Symmetry: D2
Subunit: 116 residues, 4 copies
Amino acid sequence: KCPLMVKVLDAVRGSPAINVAVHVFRKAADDTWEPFASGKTSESGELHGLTTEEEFVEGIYKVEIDTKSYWKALGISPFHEHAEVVFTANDSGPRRYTIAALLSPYSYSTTAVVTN
Amino acid sequence: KCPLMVKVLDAVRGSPAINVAVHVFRKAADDTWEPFASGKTSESGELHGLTTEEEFVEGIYKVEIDTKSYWKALGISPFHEHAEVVFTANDSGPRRYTIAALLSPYSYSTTAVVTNP
Amino acid sequence: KCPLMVKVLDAVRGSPAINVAVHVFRKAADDTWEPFASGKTSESGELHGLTTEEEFVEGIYKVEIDTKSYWKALGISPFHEHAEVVFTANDSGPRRYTIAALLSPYSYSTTAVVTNP
Amino acid sequence: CPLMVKVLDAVRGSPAINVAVHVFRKAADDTWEPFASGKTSESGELHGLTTEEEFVEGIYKVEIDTKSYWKALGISPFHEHAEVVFTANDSGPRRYTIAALLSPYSYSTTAVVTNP
């Protein structure tokens, strides 16, 4: 039950996307994106350990998912350069955020599940 | 200008899903689905010339989209046999309805928007 | 685990859809949807224990999700009567199937992930 | 109309009206230069924000101001905005259109690309 989990699924093959480059940033006071965390999509597609409740701080985030590498490798030219999910986090306090991403070569979907 | 519209798009190819079969029914009191309308999806991925406002009634409807025939032709083995949307129609009055379909080999999404003519 | 899992989520509340009734129909040789199993979605929005691996057989199935009962409980006017997904199962070997549903008052999405264990 | 942005409201079941749309373009200094801006009509679509001559090969970014739209309608949303980053005109001239299905706490985007 990580405070930020990014479950990633592939709709073309019908299986979880495996080995997708993911990067988490953070908006700073200078309106500049600074690195915050990184990881690799497992066999099941889920992610863990990107941030902890102490490190996870109020502000604006951005989750970057590298669709270019994933579909370039598998031989289908993808449209989107990557995926980005920007959201005001911990606005009302500590909560559990789940970012779900359903990928296609030329489309993707995003969902937030807030446990509160 | 048409009351019910169904739009279908292909997610893997990033294009409208062509030549996709669609069928429409009307719910009956005895829980029997009666053939209502059926057509071939246009090159734009949208249905044209389907139904008229007089044909609509306060009864339930259901629209079926044949995804499996679509994926067989292109050569990808699909998961879904077909897609079905069941919705109570004209509870208030004669309005325009639009059903969106986003097709994938192993998924699809559907959305509904209503309009008042 | 279970050969068939159905997961239901709510878009607007960012929460799993709670207290949603589901019904599973297995097709029969008479082209009739014989009842197969039914369940109640937990607070996690998921459900298990529909059918054992032995109960599953090659054929065509159907999962029906009660959307209006969920919206009537919260009080928004539904568009969709129910959500129905139809797929051939165990076509070659005893693969595992998962059906996910993302619910909004006037839209829903369904995705299926298939694994060979 | 090299680029179009269709924006639909799931809860209301109607095209979203008056959402702020902004378009950026990658620079050699890895900087986003504001390409254009617009406002969505009652149909939920945008037209004339860019021209074919102005639209050239590169990396673009389309941002949709969902934060104001759902706050205006009175429901607190999750996403600060929607970002659709994608390389363009890599293989030559083609018409690009972006569709966004919005809900408070969820959204999906699908691009349909036409060669002519």
